[PDB]
Structures are given as C-alpha cells and as structure tokens.
Amino acid sequence: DIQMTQSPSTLSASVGDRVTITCRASQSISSWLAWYQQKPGKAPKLLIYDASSLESGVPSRFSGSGSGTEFTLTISSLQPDDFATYYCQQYNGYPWTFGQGTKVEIKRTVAAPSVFIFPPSDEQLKSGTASVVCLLNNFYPREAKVQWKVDNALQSGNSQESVTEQDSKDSTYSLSSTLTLSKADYEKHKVYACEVTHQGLSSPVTKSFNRGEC
Amino acid sequence: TNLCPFGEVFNATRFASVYAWNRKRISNCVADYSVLYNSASFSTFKCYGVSPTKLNDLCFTNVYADSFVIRGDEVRQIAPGQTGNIADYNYKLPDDFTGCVIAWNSNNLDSKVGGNYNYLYRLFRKSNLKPFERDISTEIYQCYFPLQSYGFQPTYGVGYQPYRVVVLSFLLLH
Amino acid sequence: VQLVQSGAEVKKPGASVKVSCKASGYTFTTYAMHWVRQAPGQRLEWMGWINAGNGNTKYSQKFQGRVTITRDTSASTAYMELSSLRSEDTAVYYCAGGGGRRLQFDYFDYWGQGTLVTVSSASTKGPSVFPLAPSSGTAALGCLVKDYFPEPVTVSWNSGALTSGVHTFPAVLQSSGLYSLSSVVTVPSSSLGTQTYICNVNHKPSNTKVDKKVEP
Ligand SMILES: *[C@@H]1O[C@H](CO[C@@H]2O[C@@H](C)[C@@H](O)[C@@H](O)[C@@H]2O)[C@@H](O)[C@H](O)[C@H]1NC(C)=O
C-alpha cells in the first residue's frame, strides 16, 4: 500500500507568480503519476499524466516533472482560475492512492479579524441546550486559534468551528466557533469569553459576555 | 543532417499492446546501430539481414521500428516462421524478413502489484494474419470477447514477465 | 465524452446504495470506469473499476465483498453498489474513467458530476432557528440554524436584500447527529435601532420555512 504526501499543504500566491507544488511517495512509482485540479463543489480535472504528459487542452503553463520518488507540478505563470486544490495520484501500486492535496489560495496583505461573541438566546435556552458563538469576521491568513473560557476555565472538545471559502471581494476567510453545553452548565457559571490568536493581532484578543448581562 | 529518434522509441514511457502494436517510420536521418550493439541492456538482439555493422546511415532508404509488449516466453515468436498466438494473431514477420528483433525485460517498468491489465493480446482470429498485417478490432462474439490481459505482476516467472520488443525493418526501395 | 451520474441519495446504516453513471459520446466500446469517493474535506479514495468490454472488475481490498460494480452495456450505464454501510461511508461518489483509444486503467480522463451519499441514523427534520444579537462602530448580528437533518440549508437576509457583509458558514455535524451552522452579517451599529434585520431560512427537503427577526 503506497502513500503520497504533497509538500506545501497550502500556498498563497498572486496572479503571475511561478508556482510549484511537490508530491513525494513512500516507494518509487517510476513515472506512473497523474495530477488533478479540484474546485469546491466540482469534480476533479486531469492535468498531467505519466508525470509530464499534458492532458489535451489543459493550458501549457502546467508542467509535470520528476521520476521515481519525487515529483513536481510547476505553473509557469498563475491565472485567476488556477486557484484550486491540486492532487497527485500514483498508478504504480494497488489500491491507487492520492495525496492530501494543496489548496493554492490568493496571497493578500495581513488582515486581523473583528471578534464577536454571542450568548445563547433565551429562545434556545428553553430547550435544555445552550450554544455560545464566537465570530471571527473577515481575516487573513487562515492560521487562527480560538480558546473558549468559562469562568476562566479552559473549555476543550465541546466546541466546533467552520470556515468560509476565501471571500470573493477581499480574499479573506471567516470562522465561527461554537461552545455547546448543557443548560445547567450555562446557568451554573457567569463568565463566558473566547480568545482569538491571529497573525495580525500583536496580542491574543478576548471578547466576553456575562450571563444575563452581568 | 539531423538525428534519428530511436530514443523516442526505446526510451518511451509507454509501449503498445502487441495486438495493437506500434510502428514508427524512420525517414531521412542518421543514428548509430552499434550504440545498441554495445548497449547490452538487451536480452534479445537478433538480426536477419546483416550484422549491425554499417556505422552510418549506410545504404538505407526507410527504417520501420515496430514496438510492443508480449510476455517473456513469447519473444521466440518474433522471428521468421513462428506459429504461436502472437505470430498467428498479433504480429507476424515475413518469412524473408530482414531486420533485427530487439527485446529486453521490462518487469520493473510494466509489471504492477495487483497486475497491469493495460497490456493486451488477441486470442482467437478467424484466420492468421499476413505478415505486418494488423487487427485492432474489439468485436464480441456470439457472446465472448477476443482480447485477454497479461496482467503482469512482478512475482511472475521470467516466462510471464513483460518484455519490450523493438523490431527494425529495413526498406531499400528507391 | 460525457458522464452524468444519479442525483443524490441518503440511507440508514446497514442498508445499501446503488449509484448509476450513464456515459455518452464514448467513441469506442472498451474503456475503464472507476469509482472514487471523497469523504468530507478529505482525501480522494479509489475503490475499484470495471472493464467496459468483458465486464471484469478490480476492487480495492478496503471495500472487497462490500461493493459490486455492474456494467449495463445496452444502456451505456455503470452501476456501483456498496452494502452494509458503516457511516464511515458518507462521501461524494464520482465515477471516473478514460483512455479511450488506448486502454489504460491507470489515470482518470473524464469524471461524472459526483453523487453525494450520506450514512446516518437520522430521519429528515427541519431546523430550529435562533437569533444572534449584538452589543456595544461596526456591529455584528446573526441567525443560527440548529438541529436539522436534511442534506442542505440556505439562508438569506432581509428577503434577499442584504448581500454585502453576509457570511454563511459550512454546516457542522453534531454528536447528536444533526447538522447545525450559522449565518451572520456585519452592519453599522449607528443605524441599529432604525433598521430591522431578519434572516430568511429555508430548507426545502422538509418543506420548512423560517424567517427569524433579529434585534437587541
Ligand atoms: C536511453 O537512455 C539511456 C540511459 O542513459 C541516459 O538515459 C536518460 C535518463 C537520459 O538521461 C539520456 O540522455 C541518457 O543517455 C541511454 O544510454 C540510451 O542511449 C538511450 N537510448 C537511446 C535510443 O537514445
């Protein structure tokens, strides 16, 4: 069973940049290797096979390379519709297997977020469950940590995130994390806040509310 | 004054199924036979016209490079006058063939764990093929199928492992 | 060469799903047809393929004895069926294939639209929408679409009439078993009392409509 690991898991670049993802293999696959392009909500598209053969009517700017065990996919100069995730796939082995991929996203200047915190509505609080929502609006790059504190107790494992695709206008992501917790647990305590750590904040930012506006 | 692209032939990443064997015509150019004569990456190198000793494009008007993959036992069928499945149904040389058969073991390239079902050969045919005649048909019978896969996998014995074959015919007509 | 698959299905664990993939404009009659699935935001998995001629199949061991690939030569359609689903199996399911003139089972030339298959121990139910109120320059407020099990939900704001500043997040799957996401907009805090903000949630599968006022 043959494992493929593509090297820059994500990649910011601007239109016109030369761009070079990498794909490496457990074993050698001598040249039996295809590259694919995938955009959200759309099936993949073949780009290069047998490591260098450029599929029909795929622009010449794509170019595969490498034999044996390390392979590359240059893009001579990037165009707007080249922003996608890219996979490799070996056909030396069996099961055919793919890499994890490389999202190739739009480089943008650093954009610190605007943090917001939302208590559960009393409307929900009638159901026996409370949801506490922390919004990170319109930030870039993607790397960002969210720590929930309840009465200044770390909360771990009871909060899920979700993230938008790079916004069309300003090329920024946004995250919503959510502390779900029992009704009594929310009622037991007072201090609920979330802590955001982003490339651009100089210092972790905390955004807080007290149960019943205390 | 420009060179003959044997490299495009021999060093090709992919090779043809013998049933649909490939033929590349080598027009005006010069490349050296003795390069391969010494190459000794070759397990089968038999010539029927003359020893590869001519050292130039000496006295030749057209050169046809047929290439394909058969299994290891089958190479002895790429000769004048053989009569097996490959000679009868997939690739028949003229009895008065004058040319070189070149074969070499491709277990490492064309075999696959799980088995390489890409490579194919024709199994029945109403009548034998005339030499250099070809058949790429894929007609189901009435209702059973005429091609079979080698399915090379690299633990098969050398009798069943892939072999890459290059057959160089030589035209003199001018 | 055009591959068109079968809509989308969702079934209970232990059941089976059949997915057809009719393919048109193939010039020849012998080509490879694979199935490869994509779990949520995850790697692509190759499962197996069939031969368009003799009907031979090569399956990945990971699914051996669980899947079955039929080839219906008469209506140029390829079927994939996976039985006794373990909910590890929620994914999109593409049929790939290609080679055309030259056979190869190596790489995938043309893909289908993808068909999405969900495995869960849940029945259809509409959401329960909850408001996300502001505090305090620029203010942020939202809705919340919680505890729903269709496949999708779609949310707008003030009857399609707020598009700048809206953000609607990809869903989240709760250990309860129900999808739950949230949609928000950033607005000027100065014009908060004057304006009325109301999000417009619709989730079609369960025939359900909700438009929840948001205020402070
Ligand atoms: C095929 O290649 C043989 C190996 O030597 C090298 O192979 C590849 C990787 C290139 O780097 C090539 O330029 C090198 O020579 C050659 O020795 C051999 O002559 C080549 N065959 C033909 C017909 O040219």
Numbering used by the authors:
A (entry chain L): 1 to 107, 114 to 220
B (entry chain E): 333 to 474, 488 to 519
C (entry chain H): 2 to 137, 143 to 222
What does the report in the manuscript say about this coordinate set?
Here, we report on the isolation and characterization of a broad, potent, and protective antibody, P36-5D2, isolated from a SARS-CoV-2 convalescent individual and capable of neutralizing the major VOCs such as the Alpha, Beta, and Gamma variants. Through crystal and electron cryo-microscopy (cryo-EM) structure analyses, P36-5D2 was found to target a conserved epitope on the RBD of the spike protein, bypassing the three key mutations (K417N, E484K, and N501Y) responsible for immune escape from many potent neutralizing mAbs. Based on the binding specificity, P36-5D2 was closest to the class III RBD-targeting mAbs, including REGN10987, S309, C110, and C135 (8, 27, 30, 41). Similar to REGN10987 and S309, P36-5D2 barely competed with ACE2 for binding to RBD, suggesting that their mechanism of neutralization may involve immunoglobulin G (IgG)-mediated spike crosslinking on virions, steric hindrance, or aggregation of virions.
At a resolution of 3.1 Å, we found that P36-5D2 recognized an epitope consisting of 11 residues (T345, R346, L441, K444, V445, G446, G447, Y449, N450, T470, and F490) on RBD, devoid of the three key mutant residues K417N, E484K, and N501Y that facilitated escape from the neutralization of many mAbs, including some approved for EUA. Over 99.5% conservation was found at all these sites among the 1.96 million spike sequences in the GISAID EpiCoV database collected from December 2019 to July 2021. The paratope of P36-5D2 consisted of nine heavy-chain residues—T30 and T31 of HCDR1; G54 and K59 of HCDR2; and R103, Q105, F106, D107, and Y108 of HCDR3—as well as six light-chain residues: W32 of LCDR1; D50 of LCDR2; and Y91, N92, G93, and Y94 of LCDR3. The P36-5D2 epitope overlapped more with that of REGN10987 and C110 than with S309 and C135. All these five class III mAbs shared two residues, R346 and L441, among their epitopes. Interestingly, P36-5D2, C110, and C135 had light-chain variable regions all derived from germline IGKV 1-5, indicating a selective preference for the particular germline gene during the development of this class of mAbs from different infected individuals.
